[PDB]
Amino acid sequence: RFLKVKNWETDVVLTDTLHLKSTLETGCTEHICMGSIMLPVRTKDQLFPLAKEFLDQYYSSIKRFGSKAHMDRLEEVNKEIESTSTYQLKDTELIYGAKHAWRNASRCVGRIQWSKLQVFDARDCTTAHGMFNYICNHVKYATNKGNLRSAITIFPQRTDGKHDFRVWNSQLIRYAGYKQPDGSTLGDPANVQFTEICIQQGWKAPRGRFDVLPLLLQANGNDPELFQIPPELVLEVPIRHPKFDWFKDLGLKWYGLPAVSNMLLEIGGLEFSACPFSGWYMGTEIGVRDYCDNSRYNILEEVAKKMDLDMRKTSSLWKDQALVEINIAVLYSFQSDKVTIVDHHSATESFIKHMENEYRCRGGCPADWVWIVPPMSGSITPVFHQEMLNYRLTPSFEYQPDPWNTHVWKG
Amino acid sequence: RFLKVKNWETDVVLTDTLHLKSTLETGCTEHICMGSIMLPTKDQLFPLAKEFLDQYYSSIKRFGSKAHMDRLEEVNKEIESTSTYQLKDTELIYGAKHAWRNASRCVGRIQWSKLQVFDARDCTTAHGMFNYICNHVKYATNKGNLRSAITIFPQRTDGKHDFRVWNSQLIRYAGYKQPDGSTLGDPANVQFTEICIQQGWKAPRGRFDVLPLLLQANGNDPELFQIPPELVLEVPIRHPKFDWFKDLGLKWYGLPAVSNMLLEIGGLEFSACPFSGWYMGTEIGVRDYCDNSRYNILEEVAKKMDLDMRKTSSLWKDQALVEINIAVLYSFQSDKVTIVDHHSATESFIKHMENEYRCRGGCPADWVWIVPPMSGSITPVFHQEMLNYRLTPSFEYQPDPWNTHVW
Numbered sequence A: 001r002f003l004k005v006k007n008w009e010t011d012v013v014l015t016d017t018l019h020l021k022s023t024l025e026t027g028c029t030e031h032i033c034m035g036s037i038m039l040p041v042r043t044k045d046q047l048f049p050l051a052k053e054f055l056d057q058y059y060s061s062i063k064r065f066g067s068k069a070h071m072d073r074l075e076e077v078n079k080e081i082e083s084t085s086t087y088q089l090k091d092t093e094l095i096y097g098a099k100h101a102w103r104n105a106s107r108c109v110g111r112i113q114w115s116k117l118q119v120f121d122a123r124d125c126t127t128a129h130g131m132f133n134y135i136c137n138h139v140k141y142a143t144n145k146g147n148l149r150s151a152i153t154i155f156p157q158r159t160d161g162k163h164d165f166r167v168w169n170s171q172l173i174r175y176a177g178y179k180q181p182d183g184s185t186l187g188d189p190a191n192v193q194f195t196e197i198c199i200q201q202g203w204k205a206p207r208g209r210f211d212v213l214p215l216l217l218q219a220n221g222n223d224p225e226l227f228q229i230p231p232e233l234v235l236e237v238p239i240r241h242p243k244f245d246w247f248k249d250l251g252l253k254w255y256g257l258p259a260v261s262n263m264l265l266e267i268g269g270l271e272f273s274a275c276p277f278s279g280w281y282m283g284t285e286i287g288v289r290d291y292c293d294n295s296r297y298n299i300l301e302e303v304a305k306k307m308d309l310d311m312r313k314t315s316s317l318w319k320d321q322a323l324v325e326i327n328i329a330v331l332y333s334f335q336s337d338k339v340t341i342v343d344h345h346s347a348t349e350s351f352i353k354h355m356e357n358e359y360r361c362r363g364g365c366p367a368d369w370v371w372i373v374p375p376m377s378g379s380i381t382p383v384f385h386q387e388m389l390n391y392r393l394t395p396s397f398e399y400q401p402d403p404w405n406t407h408v409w410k411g
Numbered sequence B: 001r002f003l004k005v006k007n008w009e010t011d012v013v014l015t016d017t018l019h020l021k022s023t024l025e026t027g028c029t030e031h032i033c034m035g036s037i038m039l040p041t042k043d044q045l046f047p048l049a050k051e052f053l054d055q056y057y058s059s060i061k062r063f064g065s066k067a068h069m070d071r072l073e074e075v076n077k078e079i080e081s082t083s084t085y086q087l088k089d090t091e092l093i094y095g096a097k098h099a100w101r102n103a104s105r106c107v108g109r110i111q112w113s114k115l116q117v118f119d120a121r122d123c124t125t126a127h128g129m130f131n132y133i134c135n136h137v138k139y140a141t142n143k144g145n146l147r148s149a150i151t152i153f154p155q156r157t158d159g160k161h162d163f164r165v166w167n168s169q170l171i172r173y174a175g176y177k178q179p180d181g182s183t184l185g186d187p188a189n190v191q192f193t194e195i196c197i198q199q200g201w202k203a204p205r206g207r208f209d210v211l212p213l214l215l216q217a218n219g220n221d222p223e224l225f226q227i228p229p230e231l232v233l234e235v236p237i238r239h240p241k242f243d244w245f246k247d248l249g250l251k252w253y254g255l256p257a258v259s260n261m262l263l264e265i266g267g268l269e270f271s272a273c274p275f276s277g278w279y280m281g282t283e284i285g286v287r288d289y290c291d292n293s294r295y296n297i298l299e300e301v302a303k304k305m306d307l308d309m310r311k312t313s314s315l316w317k318d319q320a321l322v323e324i325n326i327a328v329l330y331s332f333q334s335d336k337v338t339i340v341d342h343h344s345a346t347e348s349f350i351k352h353m354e355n356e357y358r359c360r361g362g363c364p365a366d367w368v369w370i371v372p373p374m375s376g377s378i379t380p381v382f383h384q385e386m387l388n389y390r391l392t393p394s395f396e397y398q399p400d401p402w403n404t405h406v407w
């Protein structure tokens, strides 16, 4: 079967065959769409199909499908499964797997880059201190003094689910949040809960608006341990505006390296529960969401007050006006300090080109419109006008429950 | 079978039971989500009738009553005999209000119960249709203090006698390709304008020429009519700070009235059923003015503002988008024509969602259409999970009539 998607701005129609290779489910049925819902220990029996399917994909990509090398590797993996109940990926397969999980990430707008990914293989890691070292090297390599480079570090896979490696931070670098007795929040409200856990674990909190959180690291299913990223490794950008000289006095800065650390990488049926990855920011993530969500730094009032806009009626569009200026400041600041960042015009346009390329060469490009369309100026970016089809291919990045809810404390 | 939706800004979780009454199909499967796609007999009829009548009699707290049972039989007899049936005025008003209530793409549903229904089932000619429509246009406009309305023409019979309004909205501007190569006026309407011209219309060939109506009665060949110019309220577009803005020569119309959809009530099909409310500002200022495939004015506006257009990272498109949208809202307010901004409209829809959850067990909503095309995450609907499903009575898309009509 063939599915068609249309761009309502250009009338370009594309044809998706790739959806045929999807097995995993969406949350949707013929009777309900869940496209806007945020979040909608394996047997030998289930594992060999998953391994075979993966290695068949791998060997086709290298043009060696049905070669002796392909057949021997199936046999080698099959035997490994029956006798040890799992298997080890070759390095080539790990690299390919990681690249493809990115490629298959339907909520990621930056996929044009998927083939340039530095893979750090941390499968020899055994302790939290080892994890810490691996993570400092990643931050250093990825940051590259502002000229950011895509990277992923891969810690050992799940075995029995009692020995999991986990990074408890949701991002390697994030600012602390502190709930106050009077109900106000100091710093980033999104991270209050994790901050509390850190404090309980023994972190000494500076209690300021932008405190970089300590890493909380779990190796081999053991209780996690606290470590501080060396500050010289944490690149940050003070936020200022090209025409508004009062913008600096707002006190804003942000960090340059966004590194998601709480997701699970599935490759060939194997589960990598600690696999932090990073790229670079699109401006709106900071200027729209991190600064202007009511749930976050919530600076819209202060910015519009300093601009002296008419704030008595929503219909002046004061919020929209302050929003643009904040976003100009973020992009301005990052460019001034030579820290990689991309605007939402450039990023979405790159994505459309990537997407059409994927249709030609691969038969499709699964994409989640709810997530691909930026949180400001939606329809003046070309993605708003692009029909998309969302489906789940493996290898994949998945959500996983927060580790404080599941961890069996050893003491 | 019971579902949760979460607001990620406020942490409020809501329970949906209403989707279980869901009848029609979404386009999605467990394997593939089509959430962002724009367009994804006697035997058939009595179940549909029954389901609807059941829901009507429940709504007036008379379910299972003799008055309930008697209608069910009456309609059943009518279908068996005539192969169709007729709605009572009460059923028709309830049906129309509920099609609006169930419109998953409409952000303005807090207003759903305040709908003026104009029963035009006695209509027989295209001339009758024209009279009904001017009266709708004038009632709804109300000299700027807009009032929601629908006008309902006779239902489908054998399907060779359909009433249709060929226009996509009662009021739109014409579009003309030029030898020049470009497009004069509204590019969305080029094809429909050609149909008008070839059916007889003398085109003034300007930027903002109000299209004529092309009305089809009783499956007959459609006919042309001009809405009295004095019933088409328009607003010149000015900016409260930018004096030069008025020189762009921009205006828009006050009455948005979708006229190409199909109303389905209890299995009956009303193919001509124009309805109207009032504009949310972004519809004009973001989509109609700034879509590259529409009036596409971002470039000209940015020039006047003297922004650096050398690089996308200066957010010059974004800056000019805000101002264009400021000018729209201000221009409608100054002329006292009802309009709503995207902040106020989305705030209302969130309150409407809570009422619907508390009172009906849910509210079908298509997040993709509900979130405004500018400033998404600063409106509360951005953070609100929504379930999309299809309830009946409903407004449906239908094939453009020039593709079906045999002359």
Ligand code: HEM
Pocket (backbone or CB within 6 Å): A098, A102, A105, A107, A108, A109, A110, A111, A113, A117, A150, A151, A152, A260, A277, A278, A279, A280, A281, A282, A285, A342, A347, A397
């Ligand atoms: C090269 C620069 C990149 C850019 C500009 C980019 C862009 C983005 C953006 C804007 C988002 C949504 C962020 C949010 O709303 O929280 C996102 C999500 C995501 N990206 Fe990327 N990305 C890049 C690199 C990568 C890399 C290297 C990977 C993995 C190897 C990746 C995988 C993902 C995944 C799995 C998500 C969904 C995350 C979630 O659901 O929380 N991206 N991307």
Ligand code: HEM
Pocket (backbone or CB within 6 Å): B096, B099, B100, B103, B105, B106, B107, B108, B109, B111, B115, B148, B149, B150, B258, B275, B276, B277, B278, B279, B280, B283, B340, B345, B369, B395
């Ligand atoms: C009273 C003020 C109203 C407001 C503020 C409002 C708001 C909106 C908006 C912004 C849209 C999206 C339109 C687009 O992007 O083109 C929409 C769509 C829609 N509305 Fe409303 N609405 C109102 C009244 C009504 C009424 C009276 C009805 C029916 C009786 C209705 C039914 C619908 C339907 C069926 C759609 C989807 C139309 C389509 O798919 O093109 N609305 N509404």
Ligand SMILES: C[C@H](O)[C@H](O)[C@H]1CNc2nc(N)[nH]c(=O)c2N1
Pocket (backbone or CB within 6 Å): A035, A036, A037, A038, A370, A371, A372, B008, B382, B383, B384, B385, B386
């Ligand atoms: C409810 C809704 O799905 C939720 O707010 C989503 C919407 N789209 C998003 N898009 C991106 N890129 N990131 C997000 O966090 C969200 N949040």
Ligand SMILES: C[C@H](O)[C@H](O)[C@H]1CNc2nc(N)[nH]c(=O)c2N1
Pocket (backbone or CB within 6 Å): A008, A384, A385, A386, A387, A388, B035, B036, B037, B038, B368, B369, B370
């Ligand atoms: C392809 C995509 O679904 C399309 O651009 C949609 C997105 N959201 C929309 N939302 C509204 N209200 N109106 C629209 O026309 C659209 N277009």
Ligand SMILES: CCSCCC(=N)NCCC[C@H](N)C(=O)O
Pocket (backbone or CB within 6 Å): A108, A258, A259, A260, A277, A278, A279, A280, A281, A282, A285, A286, A289, A290
């Ligand atoms: C790591 C996978 S995507 C590459 C980096 C990125 N562009 N975003 C990560 C999410 C950042 C989050 N939205 C924030 O605003 O901090």
Ligand SMILES: CCSCCC(=N)NCCC[C@H](N)C(=O)O
Pocket (backbone or CB within 6 Å): B106, B108, B256, B257, B258, B275, B276, B277, B278, B279, B280, B283, B284, B287, B288
């Ligand atoms: C009529 C039912 S919804 C209430 C009217 C409305 N607010 N919009 C209708 C769509 C108008 C179109 N988007 C435009 O910008 O011309």
Ligand SMILES: [Zn+2]
Pocket (backbone or CB within 6 Å): A028, A032, A033, A034, A035, B028, B029, B032, B033, B034, B035
């Ligand atoms: Zn869906």
